[PDB]
């Protein structure tokens, strides 16, 4: 090998590896198998904050 990459191949690969992750599954408020709502009991606006 006589060539080294200008952008790089380690840094770009790590950045793409970090960007490849999916979006978090926001499961709060949805029913569970038995019907109870998975979640916490905080008020909605306060909990969003």
């Amino acid at each position: 090998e006589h060539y080294k990459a200008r952008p790089g191949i380690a840094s770009v690969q790590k950045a793409t590896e970090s960007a490849e992750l999916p979006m978090k599954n926001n499961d709060e408020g949805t029913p569970d198998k038995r019907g109870n709502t998975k979640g916490a009991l905080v008020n909605e606006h306060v909990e969003a904050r």
Binding site: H2, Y3, K4, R6
Partner: protein, 1069 residues
């Protein structure tokens, strides 16, 4: 300033008493005995212009490549001159080539530490083409083929910079041998010269043989050896200059000749030096000059008028909005003026004249004590007056104002005696400042004191009769009441009307004085006519040399008017009953005592201070820079002054681009009104005094130095550097200036602003290294984009008028020589290790002995050849199935197999190096596939093989193809056969890489010590070079420069000697 001393005392030797402290002890013994920018602005470095050269001037040496076979059977060893050990002007070798080596035979006293040294082509010279813009290049054997143009331009600039030298006259002799009857040979210093006596004079060697060198020497002309002309002026003295024939180079001869022409244009003489010094001294200092046949000194100091203006503009650009850059300059001028000014303070004048003031002890205000406590007469409070005087010369950049600390807090009131005295101090101090708003600030200073005592109408609500007096520092803030005096009603408010009338009537009037000389120094001042120097106050010279007290001048009139106004204010009707009768009498007595105080300062300012300033001005580290002075004309008050260094986007005219690409230059300096008032009120001369003798004694020590001459040389170097920078930038990038380009065939990248800045940095570094300069050079012209650079300056009035100065660019011998070197390189590219055209990588096997650098026309094809495929942007490659041959897309969308003649751009091959290598090298090595990779320019490295043995060159080409990289490529390897003196056998030699155009211009001679060449490439001594010796009808002073070098020319060698100025010019002490 009170420094008491405690502890660690000892004994005294004069008297054996023991003292308390060491400082008290030394006092007793005495009784017994009784940043980077500021430094560059003050002490600028001095370039080394004149440098001599004892050795012969040349840059192209002939180096052997492979040794000759002087031990051989066909020819006996007695035939060759090498056996007899006869020194020859040319090496005896089978192959000899010429290379570039600056000052390979020179001998200098000061060395430009920037040299171009090249190895013979058999070695690797790639390291000379990768210095500039190769940071991401991995291997040490390759360079990026996109910065070849920049590398070559830097190399040529270094070549010129090294070749800037002046030839030197060393000494001669006579030839006692029968060779060259009566010729006068030249000798040069060093450990030995026997080799030089043979190298310098090719036509002096004997001619016994029938070798190529011997034949050339016999064909030469006998009567062109050594000196043939001279200029002898005095018996027993060095000849001024001589003209000799010796081994030289036309290019370097022309470069040094143009350098000598520039310096000769610069040359001056002691008569002009004496005249200039006398004119600058205005007769106070008399210098002498010899009147006799001189020895033709060389003093290159006179410069044209454009470089002075350009250097002044560059200095103003360096002096931005930073006070600390120029404040030390003002302090230096102040301490220099202190050495000359005869005005000495006895600060006890005020105390003595105020002691005898009648007042009652029972009173509780004591105006005499009040004024003494307000003034606080000190001794060090005069550097402020020095700086106030010094700001007149630099009005254009520095605006000396009065610090707010001098103004009373809240403005006080007229009921307050101390505030009245503060008004007195401010009123006397203000006229001496260069601030164009002092006339309005004085009126506002008085108005703010009596708020509610009398009121006047004042424009807007924000700027009012109670607004701080120091906030009126701009022309737009001048009140209409102060403009039109009639608005102030003289019934309720007579005092303000009278003060406005006094300001409008008795304010000092501007004047001027002639300074310096333009004959040799030139006039660096701008926005004003040459040779003039403006002043705030009027200047009436005295016709007597024994000055005495007089009271008829502007400053005394101003003080009298202020005192009269205060007497009227005290003697008013609404203010009289507020004070006791005795206090009013004491105030009137003090005002009368101070009205007629006998101080010499106003007369000094009127009559002598302008003379001192005009004497100091010519020689100074920073030349004066002024703008017109206006007394009360608000319309002509300057509001801005700025400089430019670039155009906007497209317009290429500085007169059009100066408006919106300028940076304002200016900074305010704060003085102290108390010191200036004390200086005005206290001043005296020595008891006896004669101005002529005093100044003839004080000015003489100042006129023995060459700092101004060094400054002129620095200005020339700066102008040369900026012109060279803009020319070299225009070479690689498009710009507004008209310039021709010869190096377009060298591939180059698309230069950006960062690339241009890097090239500018490298050019600046090379110039500084060559001229031995450590301070900043052309640094101010690098903060922006160097692709579009221009120099201009302007200043704007209040009404809207704009006056601008756009200096013209003068010539540049450095840029001319650089362009000349590029033009010569256009034809001599081979001598610099660079080939033209492109290469062909088709396999060729034969037994013929043609050099690959000069291929036969049969083996070369181009774009116009019938039946050839040209490959461009699309290079899709399809494999083959079941024995089908793989095919690659053409430029016209046609699939073709791996066979025939192809053209590949080097960019394409770099971008697809790995994919192409695996697919193509198999067919190229064994097959009928040939590729013409087009480059335009490339370095080359030679390889010599014996033509009697098998020599396959596949390994070198394979290594080259494998090492081709998207970023870098290595040097092209060529396999060249060795020329043979006698008959030889023939062996096969596989060849892969051949050139396209002829590239054997670096070959000098083959088998130089042999009668003839039978096998291999050959060429005799080049007749086209030695034109002076081979052509009997060519005049001796003839050069054919743009095509060849000629390796032999008539060169002029000078013997001028450069002494310091004071050595030749003596002044009467």
């Amino acid at each position: 300033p009170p420094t008491a001393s405690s502890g660690h005392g000892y004994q005294c030797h004069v008297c054996s008493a023991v003292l308390f402290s060491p400082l008290d002890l030394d006092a007793h013994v005495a009784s017994h005995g009784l940043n980077r920018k500021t430094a560059q602005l003050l002490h600028a470095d001095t370039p080394r212009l004149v440098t001599w050269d004892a050795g012969l001037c040349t840059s192209f040496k002939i180096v052997p490549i492979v040794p000759a076979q002087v031990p051989q059977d066909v020819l006996a060893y007695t035939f060759f001159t090498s056996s007899y050990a006869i020194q020859s002007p040319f090496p005896e070798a089978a192959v000899s080539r010429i290379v570039v080596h600056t000052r390979w035979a020179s001998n200098v006293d000061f060395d430009r530490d920037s040299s171009v040294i090249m190895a013979p082509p058999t070695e690797n010279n790639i390291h000379l083409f990768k210095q500039l813009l190769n940071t991401e290049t991995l291997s040490v054997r390759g360079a990026n083929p996109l910065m070849f143009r920049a590398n070559v331009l830097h190399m040529l600039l270094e070549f010129v910079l090294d070749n800037l030298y002046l030839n030197r006259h060393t000494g001669f002799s006579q030839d006692h041998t029968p060779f060259t009857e009566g010729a006068n040979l030249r000798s040069l210093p060093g450990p030995d010269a026997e080799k030089w006596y043979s190298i310098m004079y090719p036509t002096r060697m004997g001619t016994p043989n029938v070798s190529k060198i011997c034949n050339f020497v016999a064909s030469c002309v006998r009567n062109r050896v050594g000196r043939f002309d001279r200029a002898q002026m005095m018996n027993g003295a060095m000849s001024e200059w001589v003209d000799v024939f010796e081994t030289s180079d036309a290019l370097t001869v022309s470069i040094r000749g143009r350098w000598m022409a520039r310096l000769a244009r610069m040359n001056i003489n002691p008569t002009e030096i004496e005249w200039a010094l006398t004119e600058c001294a205005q007769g106070y200092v008399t210098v002498t000059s010899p009147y006799a046949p001189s020895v033709n000194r060389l003093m290159p100091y006179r410069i044209s008028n454009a470089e002075r203006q350009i250097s002044q503009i560059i200095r103003v650009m360096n002096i931005g909005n930073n006070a600390t850059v120029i404040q030390p300059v003002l302090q230096d001028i102040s301490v220099l003026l202190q050495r000359i000014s005869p005005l000495q303070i006895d600060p006890t004048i005020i105390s003595n004249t105020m002691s005898t003031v009648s007042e009652s002890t029972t009173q509780t205000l004591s105006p005499a004590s009040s004024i003494l406590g307000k003034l606080r007469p000190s001794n060090s409070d005069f550097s402020s007056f020095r700086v106030a005087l010094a700001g007149w010369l630099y009005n254009g950049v520095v605006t000396t104002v009065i610090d707010d600390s001098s103004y009373p807090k809240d403005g006080g009131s007229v009921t307050s005696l101390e505030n009245l005295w503060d008004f007195f101090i401010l009123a006397l101090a203000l006229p001496l400042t260069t601030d164009p708003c002092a006339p309005v600030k004085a009126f506002m200073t008085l108005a703010n004191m009596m708020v509610g005592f009398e009121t006047i109408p004042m424009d807007n609500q924000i700027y009012t009769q109670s607004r701080r007096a120091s906030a009126f520092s701009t022309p737009h803030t001048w009140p209409r009441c102060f403009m039109n005096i009639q608005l102030i009603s003289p019934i309720d408010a007579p005092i303000l009307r009278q003060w406005a009338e006094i300001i409008h009537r008795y304010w000092p009037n501007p004047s001027q004085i002639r300074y310096g000389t333009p004959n040799v120094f030139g006039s660096a001042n701008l926005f004003t006519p040459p040779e003039v120097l403006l002043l705030p106050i009027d200047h009436q010279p005295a016709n007597v040399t024994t000055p005495t007290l007089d009271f008829t001048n502007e400053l005394t009139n101003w003080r009298a008017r202020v005192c009269e106004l205060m007497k009227n204010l005290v003697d008013n009707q609404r203010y009289q009953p507020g004070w006791t009768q005795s206090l009013v009498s004491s105030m009137r007595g003090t005002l009368g005592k101070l009205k007629l105080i006998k101080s010499m300062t106003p007369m000094y300012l009127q009559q002598l201070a302008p003379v001192e300033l005009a004497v100091i001005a010519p020689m100074l580290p920073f030349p004066p820079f002024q703008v017109p002075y206006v007394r009360l004309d608000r319309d002509r008050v300057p509001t801005m002054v700025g400089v430019t260094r670039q155009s906007r986007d497209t317009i290429t005219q500085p007169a059009l681009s100066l408006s919106t690409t300028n940076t304002t230059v200016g900074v305010p300096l704060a003085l102290d009104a108390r010191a200036i008032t004390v200086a005005l009120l206290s001043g005296k001369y020595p008891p006896d005094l004669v101005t002529n003798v005093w100044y003839a004694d004080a000015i003489y020590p100042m006129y023995a130095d060459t700092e101004v001459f060094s400054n002129l040389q620095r200005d020339v170097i700066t102008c040369e550097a900026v012109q060279t920078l803009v020319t070299l930038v225009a070479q690689i990038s498009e710009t507004q200036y008209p310039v021709d380009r010869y190096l377009d065939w060298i591939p180059s990248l698309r230069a950006s602003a960062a690339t241009a800045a890097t090239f500018a940095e490298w050019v600046n570094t090379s110039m500084k290294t060559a001229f031995d300069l450590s301070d900043m050079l052309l640094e101010p012209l690098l903060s922006g984009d160097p692709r579009m650079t221009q120099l201009a300056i302007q200043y704007q009035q209040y009404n809207g008028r704009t006056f601008n100065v756009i200096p013209e660019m003068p010539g540049s011998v450095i840029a001319d020589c650089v362009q000349l070197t590029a033009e010569v390189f256009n034809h001599e590219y081979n001598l610099f290790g660079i080939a033209r055209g492109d290469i062909i990588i088709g396999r060729v096997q034969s037994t013929h002995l043609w050099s690959p650098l000069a291929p036969p026309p049969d083996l070369v094809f181009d774009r116009d050849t019938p039946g050839v495929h040209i490959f461009g942007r699309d290079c899709r490659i399809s494999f083959g199935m079941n024995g089908a041959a793989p095919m690659i897309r053409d430029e016209t969308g046609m699939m073709v197999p791996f066979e025939g003649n192809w053209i590949f751009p080097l960019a394409l091959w770099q971008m697809n190096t790995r994919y192409f290598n695996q697919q193509f090298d198999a067919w190229i090595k064994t097959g009928e596939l040939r590729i013409r990779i087009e480059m335009g320019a490339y370095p080359y490295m030679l390889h010599y093989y014996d033509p009697r043995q098998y020599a396959n060159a596949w390994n070198l080409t394979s290594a080259w193809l494998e090492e081709i990289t998207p970023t870098s490529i290595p040097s092209v390897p060529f396999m060249v056969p060795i020329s043979s003196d006698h008959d030889i056998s023939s062996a096969p030699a596989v060849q892969y890489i051949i050139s396209t155009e002829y590239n054997d211009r670096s070959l000098f001679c083959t088998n130089s010590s042999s009668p003839q060449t039978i096998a291999g490439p050959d060429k005799h001594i080049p007749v086209e070079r030695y034109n002076i010796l081979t052509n009997p009808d060519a005049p001796p002073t003839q050069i054919q420069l743009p095509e060849v070098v000629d390796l032999y020319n008539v060169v002029t060698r000078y013997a001028y000697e450069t002494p310091p100025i004071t050595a030749v010019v003596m002044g009467v002490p």
